[PDB]
């Protein structure tokens, strides 16, 4: 994040985005991951955009 790896994120690094979702398919709060607010907003919009393209499930059940 901060030092070298990826100054910005997008709906392409599905590993990193998958690392920030609960097992039921919900975005994890920033108080748990300890991330910054701006990156949290970028993360949420990336997850929703990726979710529209059926890359990620809306719900774990479906």
């Amino acid at each position: 994040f901060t030092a070298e790896g990826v100054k910005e994120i997008d709906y392409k690094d599905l590993n990193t985005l998958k690392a920030y979702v609960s097992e039921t398919g919900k975005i994890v709060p920033s108080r748990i991951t300890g991330t910054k607010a701006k990156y949290q907003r970028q993360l949420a919009t990336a997850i929703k955009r990726a979710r529209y393209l059926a890359l990620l499930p809306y719900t774990d059940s479906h």
Partner: protein
């Protein structure tokens, strides 16, 4: 001048004309003076949920330097095509050309 990064996924049952479709879609960018910056196909994917009673689709992305007329024609063809099933357009204020993820595995 007005960038557009389009992601389009097409029906699996007729997922062989994906070539024909992509090289008939990119016929308008060059005549308008626009440069193609990326055209990546990684089709035969599994959907996270059933879209119109199917579970698989053929994915593709392309970056386009177009104007209003060419873009609007693109979404017209998309909307009236029976294989569009899904579509997204993602304007950016810069040009990207260096892959998306390829197959980092073997």
């Amino acid at each position: 001048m007005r960038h557009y990064e389009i992601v389009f996924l097409v029906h699996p049952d007729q997922s062989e004309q994906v070539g024909g479709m992509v090289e008939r879609y990119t016929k308008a960018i060059e005549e308008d003076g626009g440069k193609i910056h990326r055209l990546e196909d990684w089709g035969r994917r599994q959907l996270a949920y059933a879209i119109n009673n199917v579970h698989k689709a053929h994915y593709v992305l392309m970056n386009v330097e177009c104007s209003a007329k060419a873009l609007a024609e693109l979404e017209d063809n998309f909307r009236y095509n029976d294989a569009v099933i899904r579509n997204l357009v993602m304007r950016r204020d810069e040009a990207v050309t260096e892959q998306s993820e390829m197959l980092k595995a073997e």
